[PDB]
Amino acid sequence: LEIDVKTRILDAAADAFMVHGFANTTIDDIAEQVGATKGLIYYHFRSKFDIFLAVYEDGMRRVRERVEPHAGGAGTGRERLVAMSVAHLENLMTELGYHHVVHQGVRYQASTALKIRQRDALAALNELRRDYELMFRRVVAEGIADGSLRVVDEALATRTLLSNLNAVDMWYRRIEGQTLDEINELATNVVDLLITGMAN
Amino acid sequence: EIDVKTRILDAAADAFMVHGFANTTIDDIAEQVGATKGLIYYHFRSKFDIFLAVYEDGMRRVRERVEPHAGGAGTGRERLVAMSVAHLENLMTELGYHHVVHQGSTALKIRQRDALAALNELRRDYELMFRRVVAEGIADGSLRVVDEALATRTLLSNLNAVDMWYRRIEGQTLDEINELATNVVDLLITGMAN
């Protein structure tokens, strides 16, 4: 279809919003990375910003589907959280472009020079932000009640967990370029350190 | 302790963090510093070279804070948590400088980059000071037999990550921050699941 020609734009922007950043990237930069005119780019997206919201949209959606299915597993909460976290990681190791461009907005928060339709849309994705972290909070108390899990502040570890989770995109920047199997091994081992602990 | 160079450094580190480095300029720096337009330029070559100063200044600060906590006569688990607590208190109280120590496309000169290489060594050594502690920590049986490079790496970025949900929370007293960084450490190293 033409979903073929739009995703190329959003993949390109996802990988161009990263090295340069939004404020330091223009439509043309996308046009050059994609090898396409600047007219059709504006044909599919009415704004230099609207494009970013779409890569945002896809970034959650893509993760939104991938990690949700582990909302029920074989073990207690501990065993539920490990697999879903492993997904979130391997996801972000190949979805990397779309995932840097879902937490970037914090750098554009204060200025917030924006249209009034984009204010509603972006916030609509902000309250949708809360959904994903709540999903990760829920699988926690399932193991805490079972005792197979340690116990710590539920308003802290979720912040600490998601943060420790996405903290790895500030060290995988010059590490990309391997097999998706080799990404899964790390996604497993790292969730081990963050979950099963580094002490005895 | 009103000092001119340092106040220029904080105004920069502040703007450098919240305002994008790209979209935070010397003029942008001037408005929050209350200094003359060319005053900044008197001691600092260019926007970048302030970054060198601010990076270097707040970089060696954290190292002084945490080093005393690597030379204790204890185990890997308890000293590493000790150092990581100082890491977080540095981060929570020095958030502008601390984020800018790993915040670096522009037309850069070799000399301003040579210092950047010098800075990067400091960053690679503070972290290695964290790697050595874990090396004993699993050599002494108080820590899981976990891959060394990754465990030190994960913890370190785990501490540097407490900034992005903390930049909108920083108003509390040091009594709170010391009581906070400790919990932020426990599930960082101890983990969970019994």
Author numbering:
A (entry chain B): 5 to 204
B (entry chain A): 6 to 109, 115 to 204
Provide the publication's sentences verbatim.
The mycobacterial repressor, DarR, a TetR family regulator (TFR), was the first transcription regulator shown to bind c-di-AMP. Recently, DarR, a 201 residue, TFR regulator of a putative MDR transporter, Ms5347, in Mycobacteria was discovered and represents the focus of this work. Structures of TFR proteins reveal that they share a two-domain architecture with an N-terminal DNA-binding domain and a C-terminal inducer binding/dimerization domain. The DarR N-terminal domain consists of helices 1-3 and the dimer domain is comprised of helices α4-α9. In DarR, dimerization is mediated by helices α8 and α9, which interact with α8´ and α9´ (where the prime indicates the other subunit in the dimer) to form a four-helix bundle dimerization module.
Crystals of M. smegmatis DarR and M. baixiangningiae DarR were produced that diffracted to 3.56 Å and 1.60 Å resolution, respectively. The M. baixiangningiae DarR structure was solved by selenomethionine single wavelength anomalous diffraction (SAD) and refined to final Rwork/Rfree values of 18.5%/20.2% to 1.6 Å. This structure was then used to determine the M. smegmatis DarR structure. There are two M. smegmatis DarR dimers in the crystallographic asymmetric unit (ASU) and one DarR subunit in the M. baixiangningiae DarR structure. While the M. smegmatis and M. baixiangningiae DarR structures have essentially the same overall folds, the distances between their DNA-binding recognition helices differ (as measured by the distance between the two centrally located Tyr47 residues on each recognition helix). In M. baixiangningiae DarR the helices are separated by 50 Å while the distance between these helices of the M. smegmatis dimer is 41 Å. Analyses of the electron density in binding pockets in the M. smegmatis DarR structure showed water molecules. But there was no evident density for a ligand. The distance between HTH motifs in the DarR-DNA complex (39 Å) is similar to that between recognition helices observed in the M. smegmatis DarR structure (41 Å), supporting that the latter structure adopts a DNA-bound-like state.
